[model samples]
Target chain A: SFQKIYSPTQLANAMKLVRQQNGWTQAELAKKIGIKQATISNFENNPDNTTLTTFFKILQSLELSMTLCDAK
Target chain B: SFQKIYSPTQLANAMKLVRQQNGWTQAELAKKIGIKQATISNFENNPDNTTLTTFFKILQSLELSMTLCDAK
Candidate 1:
């Protein structure tokens, strides 16, 4: 099971936690996802303004998936 | 199981399929999803150039979610 993301803080922390669990540095992950380490760090630091396209790229590269369902 | 999407065509077709199944026109779906109907039609008609954020919005509105895993 994984932490469901409903807020910027939750998403950032979840990503950071999983990334650390994989023993990967920001640069290592950035390289794999075809982005700059600065990008990862920036999002991990402040994802309030992060764009979904880049965010999805990061998640996909890490083998993460998101589902949607009725909120009820 | 839901269809797995690895291409723009698959994603677009899936969205259309579900929307039709739910009896939602593009305009109605647009209102529910907070986007323009034109945007929906444009992506459904031609999604090769669609961006991830927009794509996710479409999926989310339809109560869909995507997951990623090691292809191996």
Candidate 2:
């Protein structure tokens, strides 16, 4: 059977990277995205709680692409 | 040092696949799960902000499982 993918922390680090790379503060990004600033803070601080849809929106906004390969 | 598991996009993708495989639109899935449709949208678009509990609920609802492994 194929193993399920696990990535709670990686997503958080990626979010931090995308935010810093774009020169956007958490508050500023949240404002632009029309979500609470605390939402962004929570996301960056603890991604394990993130929902699937929320994760997609962040990556979409940041224009990040993901590719999957067989694990060997 | 241990590498943090990175999976925002993978989780998002998995959700998308599961949703599509079951022929559930974002709205439909939300309805089934008792969450707001917008929340589903956000999850599909930006997974970085997802809550851990919420994420687990989604996976549970979708009947999906996850696993951790050594990267190399």
Candidate 3:
């Protein structure tokens, strides 16, 4: 599925969906990376609380990647 | 073309390519969005100096978007 991410909140929402798709709860995923569960929750609910580096770490944990292209 | 972004530096590199594709020099593009030319240069040359919000702003200025998906 193609998710057009325009904002940080939208990016977090998409990550949340992918996290759910992996059948792992926020705490579970956090445990895998040794981050606090609340950090994961805040990232999904309030993306500004997280930094881009942390965002990349989560992306790596999920085995996901990002692509940039011209918006249509 | 799909640019697979794994790190912030890679993200900056891809954005630079798109910025160049649109025929906008760093100073020119920065002028359009009220940012310093050096800021654009730093983002392209050293992405960690920029924040995620700034990244998104540049993305918008370049008329581009990001998509996330499972890595192959």
Candidate 4:
């Protein structure tokens, strides 16, 4: 059996780790990615309210990729 | 030609989808993951502000895997 589950917090943590590893603050990263510091803060603060486009941008900024998996 | 475009809104939508798919409300999801509802809402509302570490945690909770790609 295969099931798919989505957890917003988990994703948010991942983004945070990648950003911290680079030693970039929320404001700095937002500037680098052409977004508002508040935007970054909001996203990091609440993963559930974000849009797919924004999520994609974060992944791009962190040089990360999103993939799907099958759980049995 | 390799052109990388980052869209914050798109990623936010992705996160929203995952949350909706699970039939979870922002508050409900937050409680499940031991995070604040505000945080979940913020992430979905503004991905650019999120941290890499938080992003990872969100993915882990959602059962999503992060990857990398090479543009050539």
Please give the CA lDDT of all the candidate structures: 0.68, 0.60, 0.79, 0.62
- Each candidate structure's TM-score, on Cα atoms with residue i matched to residue i, is 0.61, 0.47, 0.82, 0.49
Instruction: Tell me the tens digit of each residue's lDDT in model 1 across A1-72.
Output: 463344555667777877898888888878888988998888788776565556666776666655433323
DockQ of 1: 0.20
What is the per-residue lDDT of model 3 for residues B1-72, given as tens digits with 9 covering 90 to 100?
Answer: 775788888888788888787788888777777888888888788876465666777888898889997767
- Candidate 1: the clashing residue pairs are A65-B67
Is candidate 2 or 3 superior in lDDT? 3
Task: Give the Cα error of residue A29 in candidate 3, in Å.
Answer: 2.3
Candidate 2 per-residue lDDT over residues A1-72, each given as its tens digit: 123443566556656776796787877766665777787777778877665555545555555534332223
Residue B57, candidate 2: how far off, in angstroms?
Answer: 12
lDDT of 2 by residue, B29-68 (tens): 6777788878767766777756765665565556554543
Judged by lDDT, which candidate is best?
3
Determine the backbone clash count of candidate 4: 79
TM-score of the first chain in candidate 3 relative to the native first chain: 0.86
Please give the range of 10 consecutive residues that has the lowest summed lDDT in model 4 chain A: A1-10
What fraction of the true interface does each of the listed models get right, in terms of native contacts kept? 0.14, 0.25, 0.65, 0.19
Error of 1 at A64 (Å): 3.6
| Model 3 local distance difference test score | 0.79
Model 1 gets an lDDT of 0.68
lDDT of 1 at B49: 61
Error of 3 at A64 (Å): 0.9
